[PDB]
Amino acid sequence: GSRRYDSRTTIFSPEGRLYQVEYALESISHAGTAIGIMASDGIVLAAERKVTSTLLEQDTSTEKLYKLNDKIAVAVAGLTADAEILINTARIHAQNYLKTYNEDIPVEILVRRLSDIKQGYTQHGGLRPFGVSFIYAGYDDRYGYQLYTSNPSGNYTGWKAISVGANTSAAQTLLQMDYKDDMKVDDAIELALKTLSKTTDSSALTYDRLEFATIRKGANDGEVYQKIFKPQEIKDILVKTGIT
Amino acid sequence: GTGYDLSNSVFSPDGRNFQVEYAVKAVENGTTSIGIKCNDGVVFAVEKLITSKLLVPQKNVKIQVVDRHIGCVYSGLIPDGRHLVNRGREEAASFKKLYKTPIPIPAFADRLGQYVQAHTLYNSVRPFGVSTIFGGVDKNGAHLYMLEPSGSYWGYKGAATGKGRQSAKAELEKLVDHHPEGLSAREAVKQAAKIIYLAHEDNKEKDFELEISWCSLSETNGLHKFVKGDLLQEAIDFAQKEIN
Amino acid sequence: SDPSSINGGIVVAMTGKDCVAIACDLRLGSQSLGVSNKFEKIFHYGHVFLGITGLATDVTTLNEMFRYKTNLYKLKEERAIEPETFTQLVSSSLYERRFGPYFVGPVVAGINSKSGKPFIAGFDLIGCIDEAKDFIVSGTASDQLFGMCESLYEPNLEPEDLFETISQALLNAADRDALSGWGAVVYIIKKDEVVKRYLKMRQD
Amino acid sequence: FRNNYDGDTVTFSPTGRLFQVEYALEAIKQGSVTVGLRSNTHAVLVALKRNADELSSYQKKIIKCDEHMGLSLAGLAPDARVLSNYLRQQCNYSSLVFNRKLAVERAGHLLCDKAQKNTQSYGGRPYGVGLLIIGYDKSGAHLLEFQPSGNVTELYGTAIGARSQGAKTYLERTLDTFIKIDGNPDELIKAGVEAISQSLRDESLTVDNLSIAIVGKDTPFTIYDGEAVAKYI
Amino acid sequence: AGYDRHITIFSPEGRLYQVEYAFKATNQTNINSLAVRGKDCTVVISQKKVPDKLLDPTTVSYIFCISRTIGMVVNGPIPDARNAALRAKAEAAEFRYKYGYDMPCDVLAKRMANLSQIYTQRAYMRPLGVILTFVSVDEELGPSIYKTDPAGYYVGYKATATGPKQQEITTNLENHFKKSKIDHINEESWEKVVEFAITHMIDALGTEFSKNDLEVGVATKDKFFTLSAENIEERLVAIAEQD
Amino acid sequence: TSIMAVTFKDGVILGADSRTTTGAYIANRVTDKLTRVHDKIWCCRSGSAADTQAIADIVQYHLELYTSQYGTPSTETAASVFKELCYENKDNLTAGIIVAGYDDKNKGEVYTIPLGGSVHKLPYAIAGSGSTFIYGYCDKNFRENMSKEETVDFIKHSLSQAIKWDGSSGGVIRMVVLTAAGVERLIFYPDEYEQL
Amino acid sequence: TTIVGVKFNNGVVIAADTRSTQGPIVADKNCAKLHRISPKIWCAGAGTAADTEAVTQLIGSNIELHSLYTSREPRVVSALQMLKQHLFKYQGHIGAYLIVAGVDPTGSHLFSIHAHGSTDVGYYLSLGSGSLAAMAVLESHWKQDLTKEEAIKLASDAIQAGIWNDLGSGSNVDVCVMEIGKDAEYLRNYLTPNVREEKQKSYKFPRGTTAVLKESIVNICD
Amino acid sequence: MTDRYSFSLTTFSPSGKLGQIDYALTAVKQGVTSLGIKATNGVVIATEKKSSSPLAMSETLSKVSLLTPDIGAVYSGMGPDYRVLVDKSRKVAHTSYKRIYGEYPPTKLLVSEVAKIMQEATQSGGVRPFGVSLLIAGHDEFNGFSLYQVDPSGSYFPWKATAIGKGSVAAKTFLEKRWNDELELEDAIHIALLTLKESVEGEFNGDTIELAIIGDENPDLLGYTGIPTDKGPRFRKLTSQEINDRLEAL
């Protein structure tokens, strides 16, 4: 029969761990690092582009920062193609919520839904899990600025600052070292770049190897604005913060 | 490596399908059965091993009819044989229902062929453990066929399978050479009785019961009928006589 | 009985010089009974405007549907939808319900952000696209609207002039329709800006 | 060898064998003995009921399928319930639709075909029980032997289960004798008990231990247990 | 791990052994065939070998009439061959019903190739151990030869050969065309094309043929048919009166 | 509509008017009601043009696949496929079909499939609104084993009468001759059959 | 509606009026009833506009995919088979009545399909409420071996019959010529015999004529 | 019967690798070299027609396929896998876009559709990943010209120029030397021909090379006239002759 070739992607190890989830997480640890830092007046998402070439078109590229809603974005660490599958369903769920209640979906509700989908591949179906980890940066009128994280297991948690992908241990220690509750978006933007700068497995940290986004509530307006920095914009902020 | 013979639809490095070949072993281990094409019909005969005096004589019939003009006999796993005839019967009913005319032997053969070939395409099923000799009379003549577990089949002048297939084939080849003009149904019945008796030597240890059936344009009106009473004994004798 | 004559209401769109206008009444009734004088029938997704007459529940449902669809479109296409494209989205969305249609009379209005060209279009309840260059009417007072428009309309009117024209067409047609009126709103649209004006009319 | 070709019914061994089927046949041999024999007027079923403890009952081994048909089981009881239930439906169908009693030979063909399906597909398992079917139809008395392999044979008499070979040789000997016990059920039944006791060894057939069933010419398939079989011990 | 050789999944070298072993099966019949295009016809020759004296020679064939216009010769075990023939016929009939015109040879080929590509990708379907050579005189393309393998690959040919001694026939034909400089047998009658076909079959295989050693199929405008033992004999005689 | 099929010495002939109406309007005055389902198996269509076309298209498909596997089909087999479709879908079809074919062993054969989906093999058959008017004529003038010329004449006269009385019939008379010699198409214009 | 098709010595031409109506009201004074199925296979539609339109695009889409898959030019008989089997399946509920023409590798063709799924072939055809006015003209002027120019004239005259004599038809004449060896040429508004006369007065209102209650700017930029 | 393979055939190894994807990529590596170069007013994609026999008719086998009138594809890897992927891509451009918006999809979105199809063969039950890498070139009103690469994992990325297959490493290097953001279409075609030469062992002419471009609109390739807004396809495969003319100025 077929049984012979079934890897059994959803079973427990004698230690009570999920093989596939564990191996998927291992896969994620080799992915470009992504950072999420929450300030009092905004949120900062920064990611390091894994592998690059002189010929790679960066203006038309996006492999780590995706817009889910006009108030929610995610930073990706893992299989891009897997992330895109999940991102699209996340986008549909946000709209279903909007159409049903005529209110933008609360950040946690969207995260719990995406995580629940992941958890499914963990308990039934016999399919490999998604080799993906997300950092969610969003805003709603019940909790304001929020930062979340979800991994292959389907677990999610809230953070003031966090990272996923390669060298998270090093990144987390550096963040836990200089983070301060009363930070400001500009401060966080700088912290983020410094952290990546010290955890990169590459020579230097140039703009062509970064993606940047911020979710602020532009004082001169009263609404929330997401800003996915453009090549040139990253190049600028990279000089200003003193990394040239 | 190895293990190419554990799953049914697998190609071994030399391009073979071992399970189909092991199926053949089940066929060779079975009772011998034959078929003889005559000038206007076909004759079927088979060896019935008398396990004990407890078997009611003449009761456990092995030859089967399909529709009203086709006879089928087989060697190997009896149950697999019936399974195939059942399909053949549905196959024939369907054909008559749509086209009105009873199904032609060549058409009927391919129906059985495609079905058996189908059981060598997946590892979720097992090949048929029988070789089948079948045929009858139709719009243009008589037709004899033999179908192997591989789904392979061809039209025959004479055919045999099972324990004493070699003796049988040998006897059959003699008739083919000594009768380029064609054997008559009457003659084929006797000749058949002989071939089974002879071929019964490869199993001379157990006593047996002879069974014959035929389909002749002149002798049975093109309908498949069993040889019984006088005509039967007359053939049994013709054999018992030439067996010494 | 007629799903299109239960709630009442009208919508009209016109093309002018480098501009387009779309207007509607504000009534929502239940047969003879007036229920709401604030039921606006014009909506927009980016710079594309959509008016919808017919069964109110469907007007509401369709708006929610097109918001939903234009939102995902923006997320994937990374640009706002255009009048011509939206028009095709409306058409195929309605036809998809060919044998259980929404009882509405949609009207699209807008200016192509890249060509600057003005655009209006109408649809029957099963999506058939009517792409006129002058005007498009819809609702329980559509006959009256055709009469008003055919006479009052002339090509290349300036924004300020088209406003007067479209407003007079809407107003006088609504006053000959038992199921229309109770307020009106007119949208004057240009490449860069869009002005929305509420009109003063009979309340009977 | 075997170990690599006996993991499921869908696999042929290198010699053309079906081990799962054979392992099923083994469950029968481990089952209590039961006998069947017929004359020209009647058919009888004699079965040795087996008990767990001396505080337990002797599991029933005979099932009535219709007024003219019934069987005895050796092996997995649950599988006999399934197969007999299917035989009950088939007999019922023949009656309701064609107002015809199902031929014993036809029942045999139906059992064979149902058993066969469970020996060619992945996922299932062969039935692990043997059956002896007796019945009186339009062609007289009949006795059938059903093997999980799907092989069904018509006989004058036979036995299946542990030490069944004893009774089987006895019958193969007594043949010319009992086959003529026409018009005398008691004589046929006694001959049945004499064949079955040829497979004893452990104990001796007692009252709550012996089970007999008969069917024939003017006798609807009926089952006798306990006191009712006392006059045969 | 070692099962990457039982089902159709990649081996560490990016190979699909099951497809490779399927190719192996195609030579199991030890039969060779070749096809050539005429000026307005297409011919396919295939060795016919009937070992058993108990067989009815008339029922032994690896050539099939798929449609009124399409013929197909199969190199491989007969059961898989007949499975491919039935499917092709069904496919050919449906195409006509749905699109209102006869399915072109190249299209039927692509369709069968795609079906094969699938057994190459889905684990529950085994590939068929056969090579299909389709021929006809397409109403748009003219004489056509398209062949498909267990890999789901297919392409058109000026001429082609298939079987154990494929390479010999192929180089033989290649040479002839390097010489003639045209991509077809410049003959007006299919009879002569059939003769050319059989002739080179002999030269390349270095063997003589009787009327029962061959099997021939011809495709012309609006029709494809197979020749009889006698139609062949007449062919063998003609070639004899030249050597 | 007026259609008929007549068997004769050398085979069989099919005939029909060329009119399709939508009320009193003649939507088509040159319609071809003689449809080919196989080389020597044709049918006459009456009732719904849409239904009969769909039915025929399917029979042709079925016979094509039949040929691919079992060779040329018998006229009886073609009639059986038509029957299957008409009987099994009697609730949704309005199709009166006459099947006519030429076999070498059987020569000409005619099977008529009326509304309910029943099949009737006959020496000849007529159908369609116009047929009612020529029942008496045909019954009086039909003869078995007529020559090709006589048969063409019988059909020509019969149909011209049907066309004469039935407003639902008209245009030209089309015929299809099915014999061992092949397939012949015949057409007859108003100026010829009207004054017969 | 008035739509016609007319074959000529080396191709086919189809034409149609430009009136669109809702009951007795003219909704579109210049709609387009000529749709394309493939570059050289065009359709003229009558009946339910949404249906003729939707059906032309569905089969057109599939015809494109079929073309790409078979590496061949689409054939008229293919669009015809796909259209009729689709319409038949829907038992006339898809109110599409079409005249389908075009040129392909096998020649030039002219057919008609009805909502229920039946098809017809001819040298000249017409459908729609103008059907009878058009046909009257065709039965009066058609002849075999028409030149491209004659066919255009004939077809164009047939629609005029409908425009003038049928209330269900009006405005302009659209034509499309498909010639065996060339590109198909779509002639939108080939004839415009119904231009509206200059109005007797201008109804331009003096600004400020309309009473306004409230005014505001609408935000379009996100 | 019935596909009973409802579990993934591509799973994570302890190292975190996805075996079947890796192997699929290896298959891509053995495939004939193919490339794409973006110019300021067009895009060129090209590959070698590795005729598997001289009796084969190389024209009857296009490695360069038109997906939409403004989008084309080329690949490196398993030809049969590519063929079905093209059929599926042409259809999805319709079903998921043209039948909804009445226009063809923009290059990034169609690419995204193809990528999804490939990602699924990486996770769905009973299948193996596609053994190919595609280079898709196209144009659309709001994005201009673009070039994308899609690998077995389903991942895709935009390029100015790149190569895949056999000598991808060498070719990519040669491209980095000659590419600038001021190349005209003809320049890219030239550079493309040079790059491809280094990867070809034998004959190098318009019958052994396959090359197409996404450029201006070809009204002459529309098939009809009469609709101002319809100007023709931007995709155009070059002819054998057209290639040779450019090879002389090599």
Ligand SMILES: *C(=O)[C@]1([C@@H](O)[C@@H]2C=CCCC2)NC(=O)[C@@H]2CCO[C@@]21C
């Ligand atoms: C004839 O039965 C008739 C034809 O229109 C029709 C057309 C083509 C083939 C089948 C026959 N059917 C009809 O409904 C009309 C009205 C009366 O009979 C018709 C002329």
Ligand SMILES: *C(=O)[C@]1([C@@H](O)[C@@H]2C=CCCC2)NC(=O)[C@@H]2CCO[C@@]21C
């Ligand atoms: C014509 O048949 C007509 C058209 O409105 C319509 C419009 C576009 C394409 C199909 C044809 N159909 C109708 O229902 C109206 C009323 C009478 O005929 C129309 C004018």
